[PDB]
Ligand binder design. Sequence first.
Ligand SMILES: OC[C@H]1O[C@@H](O)[C@H](O)[C@H](O)[C@@H]1O
Length: 286
Amino acid sequence: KPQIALLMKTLSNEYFISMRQGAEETAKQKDIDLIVQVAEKEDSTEQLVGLVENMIAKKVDAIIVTPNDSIAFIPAFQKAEKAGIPIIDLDVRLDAKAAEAAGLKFNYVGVDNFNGGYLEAKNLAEAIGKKGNVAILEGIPGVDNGEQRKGGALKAFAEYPDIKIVASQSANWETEQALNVTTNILTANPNINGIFAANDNMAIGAVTAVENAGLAGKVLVSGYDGIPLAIEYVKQGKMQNTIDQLPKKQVAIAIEHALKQINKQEIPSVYYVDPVVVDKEQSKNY
Ligand SMILES: OC[C@H]1O[C@@H](O)[C@H](O)[C@H](O)[C@@H]1O
């Protein structure tokens, strides 16, 4: 009965709670013994590497890890290759050029976050009337997934000359911070009518601001991940859209990909699940 480790940067997020649950359903279905270990602060890279190497030391059958740093985990991954343990890079993608440099072959599973943001910004751009002033809420500075979604958004508003990015501030993926930041951003420009948030938590924090500010219906918010509560807000109209990243399908493919590599079959180096744009008429399905 093969023993697989899932090593996660956090569980404080609802999104990962969702992925962990889907992970355990796939584990049960495929008769896998599944070992979940979570890092303590979301941003502590060292401790997570700590965790990966432990699993190497325990000679676990496979490891699925959601990295904490695109580069820090490379020596970890090429230690796992030397211990002949297959290993799947989930969610956050390791630096390709850096991986190239060190002779490392590694396998990712996720989504195009650039595309996801492009698709997500584009929908809100259209929603606020191809016109207005937008403000971007970003994740923890540096993380690829966050910046990718930003670059994605930026490309999209660049297509609407009557939409101008007037505010961009990091809310670090936390609801409570995005409420603070959004409030301070809404006072700063009263001509803001649309809010792009790079995850579902900051979108929720951003909606609470506009409704606090008596601005419901007058500023439209987009999010990213597709968590239940975001989806509900989309139903009620409190949100314009979120992008369902399919976190269960992702980690399902991760576990499916580990198993193949345990049985010495080839997997793609990259696998991008196809995200869904979730707005009120696609909301009918959620
Ligand atoms: O932890 C905040 C976010 O981290 C990203 O890497 C994931 O794609 C999810 O959007 C998650 O919600």
